Coordinates of C-alpha atoms in Angstrom, one line a residue:
Chain A
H1 CA 26.4 65.9 74.9
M2 CA 23.9 65.9 77.8
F3 CA 22.8 62.3 77.2
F4 CA 25.0 60.3 79.5
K5 CA 24.6 62.3 82.7
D6 CA 20.9 61.8 82.9
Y7 CA 21.2 58.1 81.8
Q8 CA 23.6 57.6 84.7
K9 CA 21.3 59.5 87.0
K10 CA 18.2 57.4 86.2
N11 CA 20.2 54.2 86.6
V12 CA 21.7 55.3 89.9
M13 CA 18.2 56.2 91.2
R14 CA 16.8 52.9 90.0
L15 CA 19.6 51.0 91.9
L16 CA 18.8 53.2 95.0
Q17 CA 15.1 52.3 94.7
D18 CA 15.8 48.6 94.4
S19 CA 18.2 48.6 97.4
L20 CA 15.6 50.5 99.4
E21 CA 13.0 47.9 98.4
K22 CA 15.1 45.0 99.6
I23 CA 16.1 46.7 102.9
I24 CA 12.6 47.8 103.9
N25 CA 11.1 44.5 102.8
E26 CA 13.3 42.4 105.0
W27 CA 12.9 45.0 107.8
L28 CA 9.1 44.8 107.6
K29 CA 9.0 41.0 107.5
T30 CA 9.9 41.0 111.3
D31 CA 7.7 43.3 113.4
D32 CA 5.6 42.9 116.5
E33 CA 2.0 43.0 117.8
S34 CA 1.7 46.7 117.4
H35 CA 2.7 46.8 113.7
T36 CA 5.2 49.5 114.7
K37 CA 7.4 49.2 111.6
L38 CA 4.3 49.3 109.3
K39 CA 3.1 52.3 111.2
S40 CA 6.4 54.2 110.7
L41 CA 6.2 53.2 107.0
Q42 CA 2.7 54.7 106.8
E43 CA 3.9 57.9 108.5
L44 CA 7.0 58.2 106.3
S45 CA 5.1 57.8 103.0
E46 CA 2.8 60.8 103.7
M47 CA 5.3 63.0 105.5
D48 CA 5.9 66.5 104.3
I49 CA 9.1 66.8 102.2
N50 CA 10.7 69.3 104.6
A51 CA 10.3 67.4 107.9
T52 CA 13.5 66.2 109.6
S53 CA 12.7 65.6 113.3
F54 CA 11.2 62.1 112.9
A55 CA 14.6 60.6 112.4
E56 CA 15.5 61.8 115.9
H57 CA 13.5 58.8 117.1
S58 CA 12.0 56.2 114.7
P59 CA 11.9 52.4 114.2
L60 CA 12.7 52.8 110.5
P61 CA 15.9 51.2 109.1
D62 CA 18.9 53.4 109.8
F63 CA 19.8 53.6 106.1
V64 CA 16.4 55.1 105.3
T65 CA 16.6 57.8 108.0
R66 CA 20.2 58.6 107.1
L67 CA 19.2 58.8 103.4
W68 CA 16.3 61.1 104.3
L69 CA 18.2 63.6 106.4
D70 CA 21.1 64.3 104.1
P71 CA 21.3 61.7 101.3
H72 CA 24.8 62.8 100.1
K73 CA 26.5 62.4 103.4
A74 CA 25.1 58.8 103.5
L75 CA 26.2 58.0 99.9
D76 CA 29.1 60.4 99.3
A77 CA 29.6 58.7 95.9
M78 CA 26.2 59.9 94.6
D79 CA 26.4 62.7 92.2
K80 CA 24.9 66.1 93.2
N81 CA 22.8 66.2 90.0
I82 CA 20.4 64.2 92.2
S83 CA 18.8 66.6 94.7
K84 CA 17.7 66.0 98.3
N85 CA 14.1 66.6 97.3
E86 CA 14.4 64.0 94.5
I87 CA 15.7 61.5 97.0
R88 CA 13.0 62.0 99.7
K89 CA 10.3 61.8 97.0
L90 CA 11.8 58.5 95.9
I91 CA 11.8 57.4 99.5
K92 CA 8.1 58.3 99.8
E93 CA 7.1 56.6 96.6
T94 CA 9.0 53.5 97.6
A95 CA 7.5 53.5 101.1
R96 CA 4.0 54.0 99.8
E97 CA 4.2 51.3 97.2
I98 CA 5.6 48.8 99.7
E99 CA 3.2 49.7 102.5
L100 CA 0.5 48.8 100.0
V101 CA 2.3 45.8 98.5
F102 CA 2.2 44.3 101.9
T103 CA -1.1 45.4 103.3
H104 CA -2.1 43.3 100.2
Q105 CA -4.3 46.1 98.8
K106 CA -2.4 45.6 95.5
Chain B
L1 CA 30.9 48.8 54.6
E2 CA 28.1 48.5 57.1
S3 CA 25.1 50.7 57.8
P4 CA 24.9 53.1 60.7
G5 CA 21.8 51.1 61.7
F6 CA 23.9 47.9 61.9
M7 CA 26.7 49.9 63.5
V8 CA 24.4 50.6 66.4
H9 CA 23.7 46.9 67.1
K10 CA 27.4 46.0 66.5
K11 CA 28.7 48.6 69.0
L12 CA 26.0 47.8 71.5
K13 CA 26.6 44.1 71.5
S14 CA 30.4 44.5 71.6
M15 CA 30.3 47.1 74.4
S16 CA 28.0 45.0 76.5
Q17 CA 30.1 41.9 76.0
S18 CA 33.3 43.7 77.0
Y19 CA 32.2 46.1 79.8
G20 CA 28.8 44.8 80.9
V21 CA 27.7 46.5 84.1
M22 CA 29.7 49.6 83.3
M23 CA 27.3 50.1 80.5
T24 CA 24.7 51.1 83.0
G25 CA 26.8 54.1 83.8
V26 CA 26.6 53.5 87.5
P27 CA 29.9 54.5 89.1
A28 CA 31.9 51.8 90.9
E29 CA 31.8 53.7 94.2
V30 CA 28.0 54.1 94.0
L31 CA 27.6 50.4 93.3
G32 CA 29.9 49.5 96.2
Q33 CA 28.1 51.9 98.6
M34 CA 24.7 50.6 97.7
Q35 CA 25.9 47.0 98.0
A36 CA 27.3 47.7 101.4
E37 CA 24.0 49.2 102.5
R38 CA 22.1 46.1 101.4
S39 CA 24.6 43.7 102.8
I40 CA 25.1 45.2 106.2
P41 CA 22.0 43.6 107.8
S42 CA 23.7 40.3 106.9
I43 CA 26.7 41.2 109.0
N44 CA 27.1 40.2 112.7
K45 CA 28.5 43.1 114.7
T46 CA 29.4 40.6 117.6
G47 CA 31.9 38.7 115.4
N48 CA 35.1 39.4 113.6
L49 CA 34.0 42.2 111.4
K50 CA 36.9 42.4 109.0
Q51 CA 36.4 38.8 107.6
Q52 CA 32.6 39.2 107.4
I53 CA 33.3 42.3 105.4
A54 CA 35.9 40.6 103.3
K55 CA 33.3 37.9 102.4
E56 CA 30.5 40.4 101.7
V57 CA 32.8 42.2 99.4
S58 CA 34.0 38.9 97.9
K59 CA 30.5 38.3 96.7
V60 CA 30.3 41.3 94.2
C61 CA 33.0 39.9 92.0
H62 CA 29.8 37.9 91.4
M63 CA 27.1 40.5 91.9
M64 CA 28.5 42.1 88.8
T65 CA 28.3 38.7 87.0
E66 CA 25.3 37.3 88.8
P67 CA 21.8 37.7 87.2
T68 CA 20.7 40.5 89.4
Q69 CA 19.3 42.6 86.5
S70 CA 15.6 42.9 85.6
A71 CA 14.3 42.3 82.1
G72 CA 12.6 45.7 82.4
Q73 CA 15.8 47.6 83.3
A74 CA 17.6 46.0 80.3
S75 CA 14.9 47.1 78.0
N76 CA 14.8 50.6 79.5
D77 CA 18.6 51.0 79.1
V78 CA 18.4 49.7 75.5
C79 CA 15.6 52.1 74.7
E80 CA 17.4 55.1 76.2
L81 CA 20.7 54.3 74.6
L82 CA 19.0 54.0 71.2
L83 CA 16.6 56.9 71.6
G84 CA 17.9 59.6 73.9
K85 CA 16.1 60.8 77.0
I86 CA 13.1 62.6 75.5
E87 CA 12.2 60.0 72.9
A88 CA 12.8 57.1 75.4
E89 CA 10.4 58.7 77.9
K90 CA 7.8 59.3 75.2
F91 CA 8.2 55.7 74.0
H92 CA 7.9 54.5 77.6
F93 CA 4.7 56.4 78.2
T94 CA 3.3 55.0 74.9
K95 CA 0.7 52.3 75.4
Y96 CA 1.4 48.7 74.2
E97 CA -0.8 47.1 71.6
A98 CA -1.7 43.4 72.0
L99 CA -0.5 40.9 69.4
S100 CA -2.9 39.6 66.8
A101 CA -3.9 35.9 66.4
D102 CA -0.9 35.2 64.1
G103 CA 0.9 38.5 64.8
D104 CA -0.7 40.0 61.7
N105 CA -0.7 43.6 62.9
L106 CA 3.0 43.6 63.7
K107 CA 4.0 41.9 60.4
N108 CA 1.8 44.3 58.5
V109 CA 3.4 47.3 60.1
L110 CA 6.8 45.7 59.3
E111 CA 6.0 44.9 55.7
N112 CA 5.0 48.5 55.0
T113 CA 8.5 49.8 55.8
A114 CA 11.5 50.0 53.6
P115 CA 14.4 47.7 54.7
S116 CA 16.8 50.3 53.2
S117 CA 15.9 53.5 55.0
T118 CA 14.3 52.8 58.4
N119 CA 15.7 51.3 61.6
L120 CA 13.1 49.9 63.9
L121 CA 12.9 49.2 67.6
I122 CA 10.2 47.0 69.0
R123 CA 9.6 46.7 72.8
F124 CA 7.8 43.5 73.9
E125 CA 6.0 43.0 77.2
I126 CA 4.8 39.5 78.1
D127 CA 2.0 39.6 80.7
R128 CA 0.8 36.6 82.7
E129 CA -2.5 36.0 84.4
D130 CA -2.3 36.8 88.1
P131 CA -5.8 35.8 89.4
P132 CA -7.1 36.3 92.9
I133 CA -5.8 33.7 95.4
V134 CA -8.1 34.6 98.3
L135 CA -11.9 34.4 98.7
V136 CA -13.4 36.7 101.4
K137 CA -16.8 35.9 102.9
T138 CA -18.4 39.1 104.3
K139 CA -21.8 40.4 105.4
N140 CA -23.2 42.8 102.9
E141 CA -23.5 45.2 105.9
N142 CA -19.7 45.1 106.3
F143 CA -18.6 45.4 102.6
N144 CA -17.4 48.6 101.0
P145 CA -16.3 48.2 97.4
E146 CA -14.2 51.4 97.8
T147 CA -12.2 50.5 100.9
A148 CA -12.1 46.7 100.2
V149 CA -8.8 45.0 99.3
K150 CA -8.3 44.6 95.6
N151 CA -7.7 41.5 93.5
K152 CA -10.1 39.5 95.6
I153 CA -13.3 37.5 95.2
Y154 CA -16.0 38.5 97.8
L155 CA -18.8 36.1 98.7
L156 CA -21.9 37.9 100.1
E157 CA -25.2 36.4 101.1
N158 CA -26.6 37.8 97.9
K159 CA -23.7 38.6 95.6
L160 CA -20.5 37.0 94.1
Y161 CA -18.2 40.0 93.6
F162 CA -14.7 40.4 92.1
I163 CA -12.6 43.4 92.7
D164 CA -9.7 43.6 90.2
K165 CA -6.3 45.2 90.8
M166 CA -7.7 48.4 89.4
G167 CA -10.4 48.6 92.0
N168 CA -13.2 47.8 89.5
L169 CA -16.2 45.9 91.0
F170 CA -17.6 43.0 88.9
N171 CA -20.7 40.9 89.5
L172 CA -19.8 37.3 88.7
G173 CA -23.4 36.3 87.8
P174 CA -25.1 34.1 90.4
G175 CA -28.5 35.1 91.8
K176 CA -29.3 35.5 95.5
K177 CA -30.4 31.9 96.1
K178 CA -27.2 30.5 94.7
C179 CA -25.1 33.1 96.5
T180 CA -26.8 32.2 99.8
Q181 CA -26.2 28.5 99.1
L182 CA -22.5 29.1 98.5
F183 CA -22.3 31.5 101.4
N184 CA -23.7 28.9 103.9
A185 CA -21.9 25.9 102.4
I186 CA -18.6 27.7 103.3
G187 CA -17.3 27.7 106.9
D188 CA -16.9 31.0 108.7
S189 CA -13.2 31.6 108.5
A190 CA -12.5 35.1 107.3
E191 CA -10.6 34.3 104.2
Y192 CA -10.1 31.1 102.1
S193 CA -7.5 30.0 99.6
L194 CA -8.2 29.5 96.0
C195 CA -4.9 27.7 95.4
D196 CA -5.5 24.4 97.2
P197 CA -5.4 21.8 94.5
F198 CA -7.0 19.1 96.7
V199 CA -9.9 21.5 97.2
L200 CA -10.2 22.3 93.5
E201 CA -9.7 18.9 91.9
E202 CA -10.4 16.4 94.7
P203 CA -13.3 18.2 96.6
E204 CA -15.2 16.4 99.3
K205 CA -16.9 18.7 101.8
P206 CA -19.6 21.2 100.7
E207 CA -16.9 23.9 101.4
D208 CA -14.7 22.3 98.8
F209 CA -17.4 22.2 96.2
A210 CA -18.4 25.8 96.9
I211 CA -14.9 27.0 96.4
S212 CA -14.4 24.9 93.3
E213 CA -17.7 26.3 91.9
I214 CA -16.6 29.9 92.6
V215 CA -13.3 29.3 90.9
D216 CA -15.1 27.8 87.9
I217 CA -17.4 30.8 87.7
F218 CA -14.3 33.1 87.8
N219 CA -12.5 31.1 85.1
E220 CA -15.5 31.0 82.7
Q221 CA -15.5 34.9 82.6
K222 CA -12.0 36.0 83.4
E223 CA -12.3 37.5 79.9
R224 CA -14.0 40.5 81.3
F225 CA -11.2 41.3 83.8
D226 CA -7.8 43.0 83.9
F227 CA -5.5 41.1 86.3
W228 CA -2.5 40.5 84.1
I229 CA 0.9 41.2 85.8
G230 CA 4.2 42.0 84.1
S231 CA 6.2 38.8 83.6
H232 CA 8.8 39.3 80.9
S233 CA 10.4 42.3 79.1
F234 CA 12.6 42.4 76.0
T235 CA 13.4 44.4 72.8
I236 CA 14.1 43.6 69.2
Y237 CA 16.2 45.9 67.0
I238 CA 15.9 45.7 63.2
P239 CA 18.6 47.8 61.5
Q240 CA 18.5 49.1 57.9
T241 CA 19.6 46.9 55.0
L242 CA 22.6 47.8 52.9
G243 CA 21.0 47.7 49.5
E244 CA 20.4 44.1 48.3
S245 CA 20.8 42.1 51.5
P246 CA 18.2 40.3 53.6
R247 CA 16.5 42.0 56.6
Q248 CA 17.4 40.5 60.1
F249 CA 16.1 41.1 63.6
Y250 CA 18.1 41.0 66.9
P251 CA 16.5 40.3 70.3
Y252 CA 18.0 42.0 73.4
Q253 CA 16.9 40.9 76.9
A254 CA 17.8 40.1 80.5
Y255 CA 16.0 37.7 82.8
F256 CA 16.3 38.2 86.6
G257 CA 17.8 35.1 88.2
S258 CA 18.8 33.5 84.9
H259 CA 21.2 35.8 82.9
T260 CA 22.2 39.4 82.3
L261 CA 22.2 41.3 79.0
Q262 CA 26.0 40.8 79.1
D263 CA 25.5 37.1 79.3
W264 CA 22.8 37.2 76.6
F265 CA 25.3 39.0 74.3
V266 CA 28.4 37.0 75.1
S267 CA 26.5 33.7 74.4
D268 CA 25.4 35.1 71.0
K269 CA 21.8 34.0 71.7
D270 CA 20.7 37.2 69.9
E271 CA 22.0 35.8 66.6
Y272 CA 20.9 32.3 67.6
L273 CA 17.3 33.5 67.6
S274 CA 17.9 35.9 64.7
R275 CA 18.5 33.0 62.5
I276 CA 14.8 31.9 62.7
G277 CA 13.6 35.0 61.0
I278 CA 11.3 37.8 62.2
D279 CA 8.2 36.4 60.6
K280 CA 8.4 33.1 62.3
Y281 CA 9.6 34.7 65.6
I282 CA 6.4 36.7 65.5
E283 CA 4.3 33.7 64.6
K284 CA 5.7 31.7 67.5
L285 CA 5.1 34.7 69.8
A286 CA 1.4 34.7 68.7
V287 CA 1.3 30.9 69.3
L288 CA 2.7 31.6 72.8
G289 CA -0.2 33.9 73.2
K290 CA -2.9 31.7 71.8
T291 CA -1.9 28.1 72.7
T292 CA -3.4 26.1 75.5
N293 CA -0.9 23.3 75.4
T294 CA 1.4 23.6 78.5
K295 CA 4.2 21.8 76.7
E296 CA 4.0 24.0 73.6
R297 CA 3.8 27.2 75.6
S298 CA 6.8 26.0 77.8
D299 CA 8.9 25.0 74.9
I300 CA 8.3 28.4 73.1
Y301 CA 8.9 30.4 76.3
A302 CA 12.1 28.4 77.1
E303 CA 13.8 28.6 73.7
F304 CA 12.9 32.3 73.4
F305 CA 13.7 33.6 76.8
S306 CA 16.0 31.2 78.7
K307 CA 19.7 31.5 79.2
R308 CA 21.4 29.6 76.3
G309 CA 22.0 26.0 77.0
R310 CA 19.3 25.9 79.7
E311 CA 16.5 25.6 77.2
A312 CA 15.5 22.0 78.1
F313 CA 15.2 23.0 81.8
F314 CA 13.9 26.6 81.9
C315 CA 10.1 25.7 81.9
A316 CA 10.2 21.9 82.7
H317 CA 8.3 20.3 85.6
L318 CA 8.1 22.9 88.4
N319 CA 8.6 25.8 86.0
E320 CA 5.8 24.7 83.6
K321 CA 4.0 27.6 81.9
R322 CA 0.5 26.4 82.6
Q323 CA -1.2 30.0 82.7
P324 CA -2.0 31.7 79.4
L325 CA 0.2 34.6 78.4
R326 CA -0.4 37.9 76.5
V327 CA 2.2 39.4 74.2
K328 CA 2.1 43.2 73.8
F329 CA 4.4 45.4 71.7
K330 CA 5.2 48.9 70.8
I331 CA 7.3 50.2 67.9
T332 CA 9.4 53.2 67.2
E333 CA 12.2 54.2 64.8
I334 CA 15.9 54.9 65.5
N335 CA 18.1 57.7 64.4
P336 CA 21.4 55.7 64.2
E337 CA 23.6 58.8 64.5
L338 CA 22.1 59.8 67.9
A339 CA 22.3 56.2 69.1
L340 CA 26.0 56.1 68.1
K341 CA 26.6 59.4 69.9
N342 CA 25.0 58.0 73.0
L343 CA 27.2 54.9 72.8
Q344 CA 30.2 57.2 72.3
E345 CA 29.5 59.2 75.5
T346 CA 29.1 55.8 77.3
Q347 CA 32.4 54.7 75.8
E348 CA 34.0 58.0 77.1
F349 CA 32.7 57.2 80.6
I350 CA 34.2 53.7 80.3
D351 CA 37.5 55.2 79.0
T352 CA 37.7 57.2 82.2
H353 CA 38.7 53.8 83.7
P354 CA 42.4 53.1 83.2
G355 CA 43.5 50.0 81.4
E356 CA 44.8 48.8 78.0
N357 CA 42.2 46.0 77.9
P358 CA 38.5 45.8 78.4
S359 CA 39.7 43.3 80.9
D360 CA 41.8 45.8 82.8
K361 CA 39.1 48.5 82.7
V362 CA 36.5 46.1 84.0
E363 CA 39.0 45.1 86.7
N364 CA 39.5 48.7 87.6
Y365 CA 35.8 49.1 88.0
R366 CA 35.6 45.9 90.0
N367 CA 38.4 46.8 92.3
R368 CA 37.0 50.3 92.9
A369 CA 33.5 48.9 93.6
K370 CA 35.1 46.4 96.1
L371 CA 37.1 49.1 97.8
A372 CA 34.1 51.4 98.1
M373 CA 32.0 48.6 99.5
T374 CA 34.7 47.7 102.1
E375 CA 35.2 51.2 103.2
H376 CA 31.5 51.9 103.4
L377 CA 31.1 48.8 105.6
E378 CA 34.0 50.0 107.8
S379 CA 32.3 53.4 108.0
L380 CA 29.1 51.8 109.1
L381 CA 30.7 49.4 111.6
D382 CA 33.5 51.5 113.3
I383 CA 36.2 49.4 111.7

């Protein structure tokens, strides 16, 4: 067997990444003089995988923080063959690539 | 009696026609929860939340039928279904090879295979030119090629530089005197646009002529640069021939905003293009890559890649294909038994949804997705 579970996993992760892209894009389009939202995106894309105290207090979208802390309490339909450390690495990759898609470096 | 190779294509087309989005393997509750997360910023917590939620959820009887699927994800799913995880990842990591003048490399690799024994999968990537749209005028004392923003032209007092998307620094040619002339003929705004048609084709000030000159210099040597961006994605499956029959190809594709793979299959456009033969399909792709006629390029692109019936409109007027395109391909072989086992596991996943019809299984999926979206929105809105 083995085939379908990982196919489903990769498609679920891709859908998650696209949703994160849309949410953080429209969240970033409307910031202020300080670039607060861009700053927290910068901070999030380089943050160590095991940190958890920034979501105490952050301008990031609530979905992003909730998905960072415990992803499976946020989306309880997500299979547990996707690990927490897979999800925060996906969050960091998305946040980095978007922080650079919109500082226009790329 | 059909071949396992043709059996793969038959089962793929007929399963995508009937079940569509369930062929991604994404559970309905996952889909509904993610839809809720992306729809909730469009919900007014002041208002009557139950009806706003009822409408947001109303919209994914359509988000399962709306063209929200990338071409790249369609090609990725096809490649994995037909190859398995390991071989699909290896094929993905494989580098594309550009198409020949008349597609000679691809047709040669095709002719040197037996239509009886081998089943072939070709992945095509259509790249479009994404040239710099911003000229930056900077003192040489304030220019670092390492930290500078990529995909930009930089005008210095002595240099005319291009930094591509890969961070590579290119000298565009002009000497120091010409660079100082262009430098001082341009006003001292930080950046300038290279996309103003009235500056390019109807220039009047010295600024306009400087910018048009710089764009001409970039155009006469864009050959040296890599600034192509991914535009279109698709695949072509060529199954084995059952003894003494002709060989046929089948294009699979999606196009974000136009159609899904399910729509592409239900409309039979795969066979519609299959009828024109692989050799002339490749020849027209090579023409798409080597023509400078905007009308020819647009007609080829439209009839190859549009939603069926929208061919006359896909690249007409505003949607003209006026930039050149590059067609790249990669090829692998299929083990039809493994592809059929993959499709069988997918069909088992589908069969976990109750219903005597593909209709009723799709409606079970749709209802479960709607229910999950509604309850996730109620969870996120205290309702």
